[PDB]
Amino acid sequence: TPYCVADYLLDRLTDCGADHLFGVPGDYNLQFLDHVIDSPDICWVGCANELNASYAADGYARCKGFAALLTTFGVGELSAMNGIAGSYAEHVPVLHIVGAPGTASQQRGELLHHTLGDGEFRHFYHMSEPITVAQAILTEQNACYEIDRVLTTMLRERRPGYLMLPADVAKKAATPPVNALTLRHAHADSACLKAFRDAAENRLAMSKRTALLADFLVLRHGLKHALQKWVKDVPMAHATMLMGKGIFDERHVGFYGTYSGSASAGAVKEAIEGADTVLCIGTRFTDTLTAGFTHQLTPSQTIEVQPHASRVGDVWFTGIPMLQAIETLVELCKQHVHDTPVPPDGSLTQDNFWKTLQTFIRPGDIILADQGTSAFGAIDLRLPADVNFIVQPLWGSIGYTLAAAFGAQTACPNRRVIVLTGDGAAQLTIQELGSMLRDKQHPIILVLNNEGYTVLRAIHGPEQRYNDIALWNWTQIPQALSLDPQAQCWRVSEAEQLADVLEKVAHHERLSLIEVMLPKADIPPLLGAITKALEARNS
Amino acid sequence: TPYCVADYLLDRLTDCGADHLFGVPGDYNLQFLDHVIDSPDICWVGCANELNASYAADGYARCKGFAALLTTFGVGELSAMNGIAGSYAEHVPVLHIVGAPGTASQQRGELLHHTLGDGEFRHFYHMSEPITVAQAILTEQNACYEIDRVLTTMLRERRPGYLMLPADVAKKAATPPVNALTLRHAHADSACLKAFRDAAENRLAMSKRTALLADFLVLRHGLKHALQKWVKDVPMAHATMLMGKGIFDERHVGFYGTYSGSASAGAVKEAIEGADTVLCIGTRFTDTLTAGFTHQLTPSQTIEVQPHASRVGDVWFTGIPMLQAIETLVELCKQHVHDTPVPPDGSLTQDNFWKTLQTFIRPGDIILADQGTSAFGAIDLRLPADVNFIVQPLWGSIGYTLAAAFGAQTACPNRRVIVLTGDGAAQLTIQELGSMLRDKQHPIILVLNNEGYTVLRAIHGPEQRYNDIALWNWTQIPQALSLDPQAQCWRVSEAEQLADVLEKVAHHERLSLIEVMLPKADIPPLLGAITKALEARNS
Numbered sequence A, B: 001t002p003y004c005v006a007d008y009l010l011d012r013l014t015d016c017g018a019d020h021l022f023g024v025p026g027d028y029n030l031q032f033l034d035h036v037i038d039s040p041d042i043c044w045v046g047c048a049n050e051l052n053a054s055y056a057a058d059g060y061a062r063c064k065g066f067a068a069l070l071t072t073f074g075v076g077e078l079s080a081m082n083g084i085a086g087s088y089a090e091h092v093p094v095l096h097i098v099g100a101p102g103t104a105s106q107q108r109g110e111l112l113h114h115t116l117g118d119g120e121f122r123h124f125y126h127m128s129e130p131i132t133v134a135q136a137i138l139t140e141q142n143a144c145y146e147i148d149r150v151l152t153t154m155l156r157e158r159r160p161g162y163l164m165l166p167a168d169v170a171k172k173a174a175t176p177p178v179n180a181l182t183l184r185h186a187h188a189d190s191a192c193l194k195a196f197r198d199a200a201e202n203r204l205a206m207s208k209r210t211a212l213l214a215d216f217l218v219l220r221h222g223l224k225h226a227l228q229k230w231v232k233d234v235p236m237a238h239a240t241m242l243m244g245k246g247i248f249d250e251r252h253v254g255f256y257g258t259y260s261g262s263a264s265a266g267a268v269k270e271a272i273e274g275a276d277t278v279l280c281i282g283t284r285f286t287d288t289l290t291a292g293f294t295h296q297l298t299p300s301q302t303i304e305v306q307p308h309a310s311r312v313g314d315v316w317f318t319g320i321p322m323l324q325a326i327e328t329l330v331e332l333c334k335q336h337v338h339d340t341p342v343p344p345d346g347s348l349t350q351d352n353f354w355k356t357l358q359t360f361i362r363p364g365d366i367i368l369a370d371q372g373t374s375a376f377g378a379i380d381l382r383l384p385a386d387v388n389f390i391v392q393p394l395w396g397s398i399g400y401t402l403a404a405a406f407g408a409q410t411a412c413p414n415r416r417v418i419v420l421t422g423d424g425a426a427q428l429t430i431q432e433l434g435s436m437l438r439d440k441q442h443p444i445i446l447v448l449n450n451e452g453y454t455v456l457r458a459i460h461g462p463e464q465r466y467n468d469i470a471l472w473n474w475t476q477i478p479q480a481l482s483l484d485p486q487a488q489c490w491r492v493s494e495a496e497q498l499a500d501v502l503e504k505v506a507h508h509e510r511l512s513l514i515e516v517m518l519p520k521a522d523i524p525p526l527l528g529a530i531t532k533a534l535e536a537r538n539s
């Protein structure tokens, strides 16, 4: 019962914004889990494996701004490694807690289970260094301030951190903090900010019209409000790329569609690439987001804002918080921007599938799309207001979407969750559907059944057997992963049928699994343009 | 069609003893897979996720002495890390091939999918260093001799290796080798071997009773044949530990049961620990194998043989191949060893389940038991001749057994495979059952349904909610993971029913899944002694 390091960690964890802890137990963390169970502030969420748990934590942090994952030493942590890496790649603040053997056992070099048999206990700690921003081995002498330093670094960088918690250290006495862990707002040096403002002001005084391109880093740094308000006060052509989709209400004036480099719609190209001044806010021009680096945006044409630095033309201004750079640009845009941007089929195909989905989505939806024709077709959806669109095109790990949806629904139990996963992707993390059923979640899961890896087929070897998959009976999965699923599952092959099923599952009273029958070679237009561009770089 | 680096690697793969390649495809390895498909010697086995493929490759190499795994850069390779780590811990030679972006893309530092977004392409290569014995990044300038070096080190050490294969490097021209990659037999220095022989002689000429203790390192180095011939030619009390189970036909004279430290049966304790000289051949005294390091074997009592060194009493003799140490001891034992070892219930319990399983096993069986009550009860089984008993008590990653069984069945399609997995463990790799169904395998899968993690319950917090799991509908799983399963499933709750069901499934005419209902608190005797031992070290 006495307050201890385990309780301190859980206290700090809630301060950061996580009300749940994902993971799977092991003998090295059971005593820590006692404090999780006993805590009135954090809810334990056992998952079906550690990889899914790390994915779910990622989806949770994309909804609540923070997440935590608990695994056991060695077998647990190394299983979650692909998940933490994806969190690092896409700037998701997920805390990895690793329950470990007591320090005396470690110092004695004992041949314990979950080790390499060499008596070494730091292999996996060091292996996790490239995919976290901060890390620590908690000791009796450092525990509380190493907890605080790692979590603070995660909050500042919006990226994963790692804590190793030996069983004995977790029971060490601690003191409840009077002060809650605070996200200290950084302020740039006044001269540096003025120098950035002066160069931006000179550049913005050049613009004949200005366009705004924002992406996922404004989502991670809690700047969604700022960019929405910014387009309101200064109406201009604005867009996101795939990663940042959902920043804006896509029905509003000034929005013409998602930007994907040369794969963009013609109206979008003129809106973004045709503007003489483009403001890039939190952008990363990855190969997928630019359809093979086919974006036409010169440095002199752009003003770029990143988490700790901003660029005007060829000059970088470092040590400037993203927020201040945005407030500067918003203030300057009220000065120099003056323009107003003048305020049902038979057989299912990709084209009519997404057309049907367009009529189904609603404000407040949480939409998750996996790599493949799912995410590459979802890019064409015109999202209404208050849509959380979760996609992972930089890391691109298939299977993330199904497990991340379990985490997202846990984060937002009162919101309608739409899961768009390919058949290939869903096989990698299928067991989390059981967790969804056990927790009585009601997402609308759409499995795109094209009988294999269609995006791989389009890239190379459509004929090749390695692009096939085992053919599952998708509508029967919930009845196997639950003793009383109470789900409603359909297998659809016509647009009429799909539209009717959508109205039936509209109010998500039960878990819904819709198996969508699609052709093997049918690809959305973004994938077509991606493969066309691949002719040059991949030969 | 021209012979190239991809063809060279596959040829070397066959030379090492692999007829299959496991993994999941990605755009960075599709062109390599074309050579896998076209090869008449190497068969592609697409898996449901990379973790399962790495587990399956481990199971494959435990049957054929070598295995290979193919993943895609970043998301594939990092998913398989827990499997490669288990292979390293238990000395299983699994080759990890990683398809990577072309060298030109990497050098340009491009923002590619499956990267961290930093332009760095070597993060994951270094992350895999602690869990491999050799690694290389193949270039146009090193590929064929780096392939040979890594595989050679894998063969010598019996441990995993890693190769990064850029797509452009795989297409580079190569030359078919005239000679096959050969496991050159190392030889000790004659004086060094004589020094060990003299010290062993001296000690062995003193023994009034001698016992032989062998374990998993004799399996990995292909010495199982040698050690059974040893006990045949020199009858003595012999045993293995859990990891090495299956080295000896356990029905032979001189065998009294598996050695597990203080958890051993009284006859086993007297047979091994009561001998004045015990020969430990390829042993590692891990916590599980010794029931909490409760083995009573003094250094003066033992002669120990390890892969590159052996010890007599307090003196180590390094640079001696295990084979030579064993041949010497065999020769010395025919001289100085003189001893002759004098030639149905109702409700299901752990006790009557293992008694029932004892009557079911046959020579030629492949038995896999996962961590938990499965592996801890399976240790009491009296194995007949020619049994491959696969268990992972050092790494101890639950979920390994189900996927490894798919690998073992692939290695041995004509052998009867019995999978003993807990309900918790099977949830981690369930998607591999789909792979077994797709490939028309016929394992006997026994799921120990005690409705949660019983071994964790035995350790701490039996009533705690963290020890619960989602309750699956096991008998319906094949019907969900296959459109037409060659499968039959049973649910049993009595010793009566299990015996009848095993009779029906005797000749493995189809895949059979038996849901065995067991009590939540029912524990095998080994687990009881382990938890009793935990009173001292874990407090």
Ligand SMILES: Cc1ncc(C[n+]2csc(CCOP(=O)(O)OP(=O)(O)O)c2C)c(N)n1
Binding pocket: A370, A371, A372, A373, A374, A396, A397, A398, A399, A421, A422, A423, A424, A425, A426, A428, A448, A450, A452, A453, A454, A455, A456, B024, B025, B026, B027, B072, B075, B076, B079
């Ligand atoms: C973990 C992981 N393994 C492998 C890949 C390589 N990969 C990229 S797309 C793809 C196919 C996706 O298949 P599916 O979900 O069926 O999509 P669709 O048919 O809609 O394209 C694969 C295997 C990946 N992205 N992530």
Ligand SMILES: Cc1ncc(C[n+]2csc(CCOP(=O)(O)OP(=O)(O)O)c2C)c(N)n1
Binding pocket: A024, A025, A026, A027, A072, A075, A076, A079, B370, B371, B372, B373, B374, B396, B397, B398, B399, B421, B422, B423, B424, B425, B426, B448, B450, B452, B453, B454, B455, B456
């Ligand atoms: C990958 C992994 N995650 C977590 C653990 C921790 N662990 C050890 S035993 C165990 C319970 C296994 O449960 P089950 O398979 O049902 O076995 P049983 O109830 O028969 O003991 C767990 C979770 C582990 N060994 N491996």
Ligand SMILES: [Mg+2]
Binding pocket: A422, A423, A424, A425, A448, A449, A450, A451, A452, A453, A454
């Ligand atoms: Mg598909």
Ligand SMILES: [Mg+2]
Binding pocket: B372, B422, B423, B424, B448, B449, B450, B451, B452, B453, B454
């Ligand atoms: Mg169990």
